[PDB]
Amino acid sequence: AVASAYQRFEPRAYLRNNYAPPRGDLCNPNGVGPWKLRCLAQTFATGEVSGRTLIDIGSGPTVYQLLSACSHFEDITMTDFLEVNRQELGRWLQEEPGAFNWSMYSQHACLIEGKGECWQDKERQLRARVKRVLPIDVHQPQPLGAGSPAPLPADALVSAFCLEAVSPDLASFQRALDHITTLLRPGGHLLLIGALEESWYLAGEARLTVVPVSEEEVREALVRSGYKVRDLRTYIMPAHLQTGVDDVKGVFFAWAQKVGL
Numbered sequence: 320a321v322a323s324a325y326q327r328f329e330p331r332a333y334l335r336n337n338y339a340p341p342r343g344d345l346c347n348p349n350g351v352g353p354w355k356l357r358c359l360a361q362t363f364a365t366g367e368v369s370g371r372t373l374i375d376i377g378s379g380p381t382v383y384q385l386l387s388a389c390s391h392f393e394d395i396t397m398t399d400f401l402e403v404n405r406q407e408l409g410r411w412l413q414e415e416p417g418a419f420n421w422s423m424y425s426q427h428a429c430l431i432e433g434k435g436e437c438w439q440d441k442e443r444q445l446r447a448r449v450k451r452v453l454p455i456d457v458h459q460p461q462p463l464g465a466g467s468p469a470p471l472p473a474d475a476l477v478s479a480f481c482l483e484a485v486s487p488d489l490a491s492f493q494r495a496l497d498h499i500t501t502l503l504r505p506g507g508h509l510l511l512i513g514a515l516e517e518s519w520y521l522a523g524e525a526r527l528t529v530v531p532v533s534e535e536e537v538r539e540a541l542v543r544s545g546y547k548v549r550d551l552r553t554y555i556m557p558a559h560l561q562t563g564v565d566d567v568k569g570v571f572f573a574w575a576q577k578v579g580l
């Protein structure tokens with residue numbers, strides 16, 4: 320019942336604790352930012368993750384997870400439990416007042432994708448291909464929605480730092496993976512990112528309990544959920560990026576594919 324803890328969840332403080340210097344300074348290439356962006360880039364660049372519809376589970380108030388993704392899917396669905404986040408996403412989608420500045424990220428995305436595109440173009444392609452920001456709950460068998468405006472089955476899935484942060488144990492985690500997995504077509508791809516062996520992280524007045532997980536657990540889970548792991552990489556949190564906003568030890572990136580058998 321973590322749900323009660325997220326109610327105090329402050330998006331502005333969250334973003335600040337994870338997407339501002341030092342973690343949000345994409346200048347140094349040995350950072351979390353460059354790494355996550357690079358994993359995403361390299362994956363889609365293989366051109367094996369392609370389709371029409373794509374869904375991002377547990378978007379929170381961030382967009383970086385779709386900068387490279389938007390290029391390959393015309394219909395995109397952002398999601399998240401807290402409306403405060405859904406609202407925060409909007410301010411950025413609609414270029415509204417005081418939205419969060421994702422420039423540094425957009426630029427580094429264009430830098431890495433090396434397609435020569437400028438960030439405004441990419442940011443515009445994202446805002447364009449993002450259709451709706453739908454409320455979601457990974458704990459429901461039919462993940463938030465009985466008859467959602469979201470095209471199902473989505474041709475692809477993307478989740479960053481969600482599962483481990485809304486599940487109290489490795490069990491709910493599996494159940495949570497199973498759940499969202501139902502939205503993914505039988506050959507669809509899943510790009511999952513998460514915290515490795517972390518157990519808590521601040522976000523303003525709120526204090527979230529998370530499930531410390533390992534690469535092998537994450538793997539076994541993807542498998543035990545019906546996926547065929549294609550790539551599973553792990554970033555180890557450097558010292559300078561270990562502030563007091565959480566206790567993450569490292570970060571994982573998984574390119575999973577729903578077995579078509």
Ligand SMILES: Nc1ncnc2c1ncn2[C@@H]1O[C@H](CSCC[C@H](N)C(=O)O)[C@@H](O)[C@H]1O
Nearest residue numbers: 377378379381400401455456457479480485
């Ligand atoms: N039951 C639930 N189902 C889905 N998302 C949930 C949830 N409970 C909380 N969340 C959302 O899970 C997110 C974890 S934070 C990760 C945010 C974003 N992906 C970025 O990469 O950082 C929060 O935005 C929180 O609101």
Ligand SMILES: Clc1ccc2c(c1Cl)CNCCC2
Nearest residue numbers: 337342351480514520565567
């Ligand atoms: Cl870089 C980066 C980005 C997002 C998140 C973390 C890290 Cl380490 C881990 N701390 C908890 C919030 C999720």
